[PDB]
Amino acid sequence: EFRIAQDVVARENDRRASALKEDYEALGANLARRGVDIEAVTAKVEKFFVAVPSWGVGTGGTRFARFPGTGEPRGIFDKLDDCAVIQQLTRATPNVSLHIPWDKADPKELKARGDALGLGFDAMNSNTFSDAPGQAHSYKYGSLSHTNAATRAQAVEHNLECIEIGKAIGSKALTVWIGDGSNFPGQSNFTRAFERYLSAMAEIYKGLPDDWKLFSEHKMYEPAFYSTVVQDWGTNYLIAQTLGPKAQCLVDLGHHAPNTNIEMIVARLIQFGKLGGFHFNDSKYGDDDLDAGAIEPYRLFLVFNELVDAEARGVKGFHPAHMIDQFHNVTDPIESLINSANEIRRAYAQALLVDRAALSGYQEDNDALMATETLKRAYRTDVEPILAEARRRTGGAVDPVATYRASGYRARVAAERPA
Amino acid sequence: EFRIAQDVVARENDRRASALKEDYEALGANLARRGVDIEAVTAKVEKFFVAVPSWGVGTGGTRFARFPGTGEPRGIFDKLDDCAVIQQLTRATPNVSLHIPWDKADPKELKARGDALGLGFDAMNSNTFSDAPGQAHSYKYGSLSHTNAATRAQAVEHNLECIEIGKAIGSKALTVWIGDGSNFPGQSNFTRAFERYLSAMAEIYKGLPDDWKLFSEHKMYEPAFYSTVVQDWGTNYLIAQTLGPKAQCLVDLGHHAPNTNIEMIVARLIQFGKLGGFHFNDSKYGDDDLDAGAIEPYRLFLVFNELVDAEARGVKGFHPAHMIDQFHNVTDPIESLINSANEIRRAYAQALLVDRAALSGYQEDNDALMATETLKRAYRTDVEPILAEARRRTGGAVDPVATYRASGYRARVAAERPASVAGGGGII
Amino acid sequence: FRIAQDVVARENDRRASALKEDYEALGANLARRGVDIEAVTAKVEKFFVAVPSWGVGTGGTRFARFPGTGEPRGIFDKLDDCAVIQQLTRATPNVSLHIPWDKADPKELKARGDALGLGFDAMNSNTFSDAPGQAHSYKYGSLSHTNAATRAQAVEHNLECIEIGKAIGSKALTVWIGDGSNFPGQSNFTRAFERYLSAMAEIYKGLPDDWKLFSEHKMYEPAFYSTVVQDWGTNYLIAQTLGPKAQCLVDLGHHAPNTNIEMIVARLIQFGKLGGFHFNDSKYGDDDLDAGAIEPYRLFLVFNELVDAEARGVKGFHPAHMIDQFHNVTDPIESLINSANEIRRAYAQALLVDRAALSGYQEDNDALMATETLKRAYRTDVEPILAEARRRTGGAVDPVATYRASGYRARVAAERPASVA
Amino acid sequence: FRIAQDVVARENDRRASALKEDYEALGANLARRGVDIEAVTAKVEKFFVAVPSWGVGTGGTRFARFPGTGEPRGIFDKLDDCAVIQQLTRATPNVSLHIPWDKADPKELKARGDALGLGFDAMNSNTFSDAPGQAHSYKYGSLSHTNAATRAQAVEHNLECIEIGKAIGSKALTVWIGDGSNFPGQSNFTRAFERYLSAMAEIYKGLPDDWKLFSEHKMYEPAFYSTVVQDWGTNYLIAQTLGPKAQCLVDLGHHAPNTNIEMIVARLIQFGKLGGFHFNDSKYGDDDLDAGAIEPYRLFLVFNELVDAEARGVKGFHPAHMIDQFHNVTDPIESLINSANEIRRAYAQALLVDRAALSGYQEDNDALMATETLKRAYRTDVEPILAEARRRTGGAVDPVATYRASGYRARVAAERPASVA
Numbered sequence A: 001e002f003r004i005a006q007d008v009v010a011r012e013n014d015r016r017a018s019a020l021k022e023d024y025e026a027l028g029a030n031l032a033r034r035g036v037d038i039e040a041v042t043a044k045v046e047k048f049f050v051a052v053p054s055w056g057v058g059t060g061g062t063r064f065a066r067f068p069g070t071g072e073p074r075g076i077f078d079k080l081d082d083c084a085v086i087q088q089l090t091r092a093t094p095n096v097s098l099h100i101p102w103d104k105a106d107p108k109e110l111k112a113r114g115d116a117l118g119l120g121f122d123a124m125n126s127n128t129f130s131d132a133p134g135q136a137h138s139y140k141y142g143s144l145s146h147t148n149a150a151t152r153a154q155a156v157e158h159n160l161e162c163i164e165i166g167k168a169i170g171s172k173a174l175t176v177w178i179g180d181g182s183n184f185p186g187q188s189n190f191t192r193a194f195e196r197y198l199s200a201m202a203e204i205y206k207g208l209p210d211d212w213k214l215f216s217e218h219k220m221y222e223p224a225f226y227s228t229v230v231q232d233w234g235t236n237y238l239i240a241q242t243l244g245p246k247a248q249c250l251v252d253l254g255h256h257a258p259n260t261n262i263e264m265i266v267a268r269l270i271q272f273g274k275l276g277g278f279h280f281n282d283s284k285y286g287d288d289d290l291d292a293g294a295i296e297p298y299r300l301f302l303v304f305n306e307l308v309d310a311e312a313r314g315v316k317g318f319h320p321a322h323m324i325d326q327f328h329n330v331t332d333p334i335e336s337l338i339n340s341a342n343e344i345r346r347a348y349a350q351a352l353l354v355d356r357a358a359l360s361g362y363q364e365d366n367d368a369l370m371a372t373e374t375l376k377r378a379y380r381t382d383v384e385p386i387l388a389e390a391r392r393r394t395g396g397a398v399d400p401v402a403t404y405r406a407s408g409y410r411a412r413v414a415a416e417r418p419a
Numbered sequence B: 001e002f003r004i005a006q007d008v009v010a011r012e013n014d015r016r017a018s019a020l021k022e023d024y025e026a027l028g029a030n031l032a033r034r035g036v037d038i039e040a041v042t043a044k045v046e047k048f049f050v051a052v053p054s055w056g057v058g059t060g061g062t063r064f065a066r067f068p069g070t071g072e073p074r075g076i077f078d079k080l081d082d083c084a085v086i087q088q089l090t091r092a093t094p095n096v097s098l099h100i101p102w103d104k105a106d107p108k109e110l111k112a113r114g115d116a117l118g119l120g121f122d123a124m125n126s127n128t129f130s131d132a133p134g135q136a137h138s139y140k141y142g143s144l145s146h147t148n149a150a151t152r153a154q155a156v157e158h159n160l161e162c163i164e165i166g167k168a169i170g171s172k173a174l175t176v177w178i179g180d181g182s183n184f185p186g187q188s189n190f191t192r193a194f195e196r197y198l199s200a201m202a203e204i205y206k207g208l209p210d211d212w213k214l215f216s217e218h219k220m221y222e223p224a225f226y227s228t229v230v231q232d233w234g235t236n237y238l239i240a241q242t243l244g245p246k247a248q249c250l251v252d253l254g255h256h257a258p259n260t261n262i263e264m265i266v267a268r269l270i271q272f273g274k275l276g277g278f279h280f281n282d283s284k285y286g287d288d289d290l291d292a293g294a295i296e297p298y299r300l301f302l303v304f305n306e307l308v309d310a311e312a313r314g315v316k317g318f319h320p321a322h323m324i325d326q327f328h329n330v331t332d333p334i335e336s337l338i339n340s341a342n343e344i345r346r347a348y349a350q351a352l353l354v355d356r357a358a359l360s361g362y363q364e365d366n367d368a369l370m371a372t373e374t375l376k377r378a379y380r381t382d383v384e385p386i387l388a389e390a391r392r393r394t395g396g397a398v399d400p401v402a403t404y405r406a407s408g409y410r411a412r413v414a415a416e417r418p419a420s421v422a423g424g425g426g427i428i
Numbered sequence C, D: 001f002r003i004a005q006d007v008v009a010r011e012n013d014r015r016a017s018a019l020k021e022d023y024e025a026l027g028a029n030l031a032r033r034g035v036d037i038e039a040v041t042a043k044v045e046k047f048f049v050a051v052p053s054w055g056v057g058t059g060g061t062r063f064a065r066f067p068g069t070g071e072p073r074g075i076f077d078k079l080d081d082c083a084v085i086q087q088l089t090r091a092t093p094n095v096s097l098h099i100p101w102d103k104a105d106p107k108e109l110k111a112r113g114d115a116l117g118l119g120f121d122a123m124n125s126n127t128f129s130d131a132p133g134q135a136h137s138y139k140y141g142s143l144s145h146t147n148a149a150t151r152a153q154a155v156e157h158n159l160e161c162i163e164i165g166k167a168i169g170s171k172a173l174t175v176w177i178g179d180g181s182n183f184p185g186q187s188n189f190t191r192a193f194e195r196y197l198s199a200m201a202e203i204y205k206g207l208p209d210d211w212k213l214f215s216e217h218k219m220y221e222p223a224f225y226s227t228v229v230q231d232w233g234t235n236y237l238i239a240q241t242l243g244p245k246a247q248c249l250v251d252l253g254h255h256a257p258n259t260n261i262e263m264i265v266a267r268l269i270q271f272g273k274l275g276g277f278h279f280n281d282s283k284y285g286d287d288d289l290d291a292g293a294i295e296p297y298r299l300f301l302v303f304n305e306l307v308d309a310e311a312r313g314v315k316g317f318h319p320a321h322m323i324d325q326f327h328n329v330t331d332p333i334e335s336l337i338n339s340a341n342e343i344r345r346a347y348a349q350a351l352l353v354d355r356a357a358l359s360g361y362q363e364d365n366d367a368l369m370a371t372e373t374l375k376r377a378y379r380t381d382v383e384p385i386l387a388e389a390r391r392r393t394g395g396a397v398d399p400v401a402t403y404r405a406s407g408y409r410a411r412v413a414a415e416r417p418a419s420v421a
């Protein structure tokens, strides 16, 4: 089934075919003059996939308010339908990231709906940062690192339940992000809290399938405003190293202190084999969770530069999980996810254009200016023609958002869904 | 009416009177050696008041979750009852700051309850950063600076109603904080958006009584994550200067960029007569809204040092409004507000101890070390005996939190009020 | 000609074919977007940014300085090097001088400038360091120093900068001082600012009718607790207090972490106090790195505000543009060349924004299409436009490549002795 | 004795009465709190922090240096000044040397220290600046430089620092380098780190059995885009990779804005890699200001983690403590005196925390009482304890007051030639 009529996609592609051909051939010639085969780039671009968050499909909110749009998805099933649109048009988001209990539903049915829509499932995400009605023990003061044994046990059990749901739908990993920390100095004993967390995570690791990975996600602050147990990549490394080979670190771009060189963290984790994956988004102040690349596109390019370099250096067994973790508070969630996915492919595409041989020589000779200009020659390249062509060739739209709007999908779901 | 039994307050004071006497006399002796009359300090401390937020007595939350405790207040009347407890035990929070429409209710009943509890009302707070039921225009894309004329008018009308409610209950000011801003470059035109805001505020200004003040509150970010119309004190000054004499700037401690020298902003606003008031709280990362002084007590003291210095050299009827703006997500709201009000008086008391004459000399001599040590000599002084004696002398408790727990108030209201349920904040 | 014309010719010819292909390709793409590439190029070749005299020599940190070969011996050598930057980029016809660093006979300075085809931008005073034979030290401040005689000495220095500037063609004085404190209590915030205001008022009195006085704010460094002119708020208060000739200068790296700098620019323009810019890039503090090397989009967003001002028809809006950078690990001339290029790049992209469409998306609160309208311009590779603008005006298609081909650095290295103490 | 004993005695007697009153009052308050003031004073008397040789001279920024009078020139003058701090505070018996700044015949250094009653803490290498005659420049790095010969030169310099240290009684080498990049792409993060690790392994081999090697992380400066040893995470990787003798040194002002530093301290202690501390305070960057002059509570919280660690009896816990500050606008000796004082103040308050009560409130999630339990200790004015500790150990009740009364600064000013006067 196709959420967006195929005739609309065809019509909107034909409407832009002429211009695209000119832009693509123009870029192809320019790249050839630079010794790059544009076909080789497009080929890799159409293979780059990033998972879409179920929680990004509906309108998000802040601690102050939530302003829903029309046709808000009623549950995980409506969310999957909307995710299908993103994948149909960008062809870059074949897998969906689920969050439990937000997306709790019959696993078998989730699998059926996913298969019918042509969608897969990425890492599962546990939730012990909020209480569910009728919950025996509250996570107000923590979960996996809570002082109360029963509360930790409950948190662990919930994570095991997430694993069970994931196994039913085809997921192969569990991402653990908790709000555990303190809001006041002295409230928590930093070391003891971390010891409890490590002990609890060891129990989850014990119940982790051998064809699964366990991802721990660090965050400097929020919901905890004084200290957070898994506060940065340093603590995260200690966790992954301590737990085992199947445990790795997940880097969410917006979870770092102001001015942090995030691309270096990525490099460090790769070198020591603990870079499990990414949670893509952009920010300017805190964990803003804005559309990827909308604030600092160069930074996004530099992160991918490290990923591509890893391959170039011959790093092996390197297959980071890529996921978008965003909240869309003032835009059509589907549109933002579409352009965010496009932006991630944009950064990846530019990273592929870096002349590694040239860069290597400038680094060795300490020619900083030419080294940075070598990175810029790649970043400054407008790879949109490649992104559009990759989409067109794989059943997607030349201009996803334009086709999305031309289809009238939002008004359609608005009529189908309550207000 | 006494929310907390007088016998309990008396009992809990007698239990600690002996130790207090010793500490107070020791401190009095130390201050005397320093040429300071402990009695003069206590006399001023007894008269220092800071407004408590009504939204502060209820458990707060984050965008990820809210964990309500037992006996959560149902509405403004329950909240007023709880604020009465903070005032009775600390004697430092006689006025409550209301937020509309969270606390909307009959002005006669509000004023009636306040009077019976011995509570007054500080500045009113308007809410155009959220949508209420039946609202004709959404504030999703802004309010006073929204591109839609009808929306701006609706926001203006709401503020005018806030002034109306405040006039009926004895309030003398309106504080305006909005989330207006953008999450993406290009979404808003910085200039046009600010021009729209100024024009809307002008209409609100026209509705201000002659003895009222309009406080605009800046904030770097949240809920807007790319730009905010009233992002800092610079824009805030432009606003106040543009609107008029009754318009001044409100400084919320946790609303500044990382590493900002906040005490300097206070000085600058005072110098140009635009320091409307304060929103006290503490933080480490963003607008954490934590208990005042719990993270950086020295910074709080330094802010009060600017306030006391201005006071010491008599300036333009200088009387900024002091208010606490905090959310308590992991403690008993009443206890945190009690100790936060205490910390504010603590910083004030310490600022009073600064030898202004000596500091002035060291500043003119460019003796940086002695100048900073002059400040530290005051700050390092443990003024707790003063704070406790000030409380004891005015009908308060020597140890407020201790007295609060001994009274069993929380267990009491928990039994009278419906049980609560945890859930999310507005993440989805 | 600092750089041989035959070299510039040879290097341009070697790249003419590729430029033609890229420019014409870009031209067609722009035409399809309703934009005339010729109109963009015509404006780009006229965008100028002043080159800092202090940026031509290698810079350093409080830890060390690593000079390269052929470091300029004085201001005259610096002007010679600035001539290279202008000849190759054609985007830096004016130089910004710093007194006393560049103190010399005004007549000679002017003669060298005219000979090289260079002009002079705003003068820069220096009361953040002590010069020989000074009666009072600026250790504890200058224009805001508690000692009246020290403030007077600083005022006199600024007036002298104005006299030098008048003689050489300058029409503005930029004032940046380190005045502030490293400890709470060391300074009375208000009295220190009042002293500063009194001093600046005197300097203002020495301003010719057609001159401007620019005060430059900075959050910290050299002062590490408080700085008198710490941010744009205090800066606005200064400009408004002083008068019509007093305006604010914004140095990109002088703001608190995460500050929305483009908004400050918009605010100052709205109230007519945006005197000019000090361009550079940074990641941590006032790093003074090559413009656009760290955050190119932010640079573009700043220019988006500058172009919007013209779009909105702001009157008498002629901000001064100056590069304020230090080059610690690269050939200063090469960094200044590419930095000037980056600035023209951000400017050109700002010119490509479809303001009509943008205006529509803003009014309809279509945040996604509004930001995409900005991105469509920013994502455009305008390098061909920059290169064509240079070709037409006597510059180099690839400035740094041409600079390296000329062997200029090696030449001046043999002419200039390295300082030994 | 640098300071006349009669002056110390006279200034102590002058303030003995008030001290007795305050100490006794504090003793009674603590008594009521179940604490023996005598036990606290006894521990404070034994808390020592290394004074940096580079701390007694006036510091500066990249913009300027404003030397005071009697500036110490060379290590011998510096040791004489350091002796004044130790004599008056009795809290800084050991000095931290920096090579080559303090290079001199080891025998003479040892002799001079013994004569002044001063020992030597960790040695400090310097490959972040170039020395005269140096074969290879550290402009683009040192231990992680791409040029093999440059790395070898840096390794040898470090080995030389160990040799000097062994001769004077030092038992550790602290390695802080500016290695990094100012531009994206300039360095390959991983390869640069691999080169550093290989270089440090060589240095590690020259370590005696009883020596420690400390690596000090820093977010930025002098490198403004990336730094090889940028944070504690990379620092942990280094220490763990090198071996048991390698540990991490934490300099308070070397972290990103808002970083929870006390947590990093706890984490390093838990994994046995907390080598030591570099004390100072800051507000913006690596300001290197007097310890506790900006954020005294943060300093207390760091000591809370240290005192707790001992309370828990953690293994591998025995951190070195050193002051690493620069004094740009004060008498360096007075600042080091009051900084050492602040450090003992924070230590003393940490000793007052009721660990049993705290533990209870932590287990019961009573956040308010847990934090108040810390505040009850922090709010306590321990100055009487600090003053008494000094008085009882040969120091001054009021160090700075005694220092000024002695007229020391004027004395050395008359013995040492200033650049101009």
Ligand SMILES: O=C(CO)[C@H](O)[C@H](O)[C@H](O)CO
Residues within 6 Å of the ligand: A055, A125, A177, A217, A219, A252, A279, A287, A325, B427
């Ligand atoms: O980033 C995170 C919270 O800050 C986690 O990944 C969450 O699970 C995700 O954002 C959904 O709330």
Ligand SMILES: O=C(CO)[C@H](O)[C@H](O)[C@H](O)CO
Residues within 6 Å of the ligand: B055, B125, B177, B217, B219, B252, B279, B287, B325
């Ligand atoms: O600080 C504020 C929001 O950040 C405003 O004062 C609010 O009105 C107050 O905090 C209540 O949410």
Ligand SMILES: O=C(CO)[C@H](O)[C@H](O)[C@H](O)CO
Residues within 6 Å of the ligand: C054, C124, C176, C216, C218, C251, C278, C286, C324
């Ligand atoms: O930016 C500044 C100092 O931070 C001023 O403009 C200086 O005068 C300039 O950078 C030269 O040092």
Ligand SMILES: O=C(CO)[C@H](O)[C@H](O)[C@H](O)CO
Residues within 6 Å of the ligand: D054, D124, D176, D216, D218, D251, D278, D286, D324
């Ligand atoms: O802190 C450091 C430099 O930032 C190192 O410890 C230095 O060796 C010390 O500060 C002396 O410059």
Ligand SMILES: [Mn+2]
Residues within 6 Å of the ligand: A177, A217, A252, A279, A325
């Ligand atoms: Mn995430």
Ligand SMILES: [Mn+2]
Residues within 6 Å of the ligand: A252, A254, A255, A287, A289
């Ligand atoms: Mn997040």
Ligand SMILES: [Mn+2]
Residues within 6 Å of the ligand: B177, B217, B252, B279, B325
């Ligand atoms: Mn507030």
Ligand SMILES: [Mn+2]
Residues within 6 Å of the ligand: B219, B252, B255, B287, B289
């Ligand atoms: Mn707030």
Ligand SMILES: [Mn+2]
Residues within 6 Å of the ligand: C176, C216, C251, C278, C324
């Ligand atoms: Mn500048």
Ligand SMILES: [Mn+2]
Residues within 6 Å of the ligand: C218, C251, C253, C254, C286
């Ligand atoms: Mn600067």
Ligand SMILES: [Mn+2]
Residues within 6 Å of the ligand: D176, D216, D251, D278, D324
């Ligand atoms: Mn250090």
Ligand SMILES: [Mn+2]
Residues within 6 Å of the ligand: D251, D254, D286
């Ligand atoms: Mn340092």
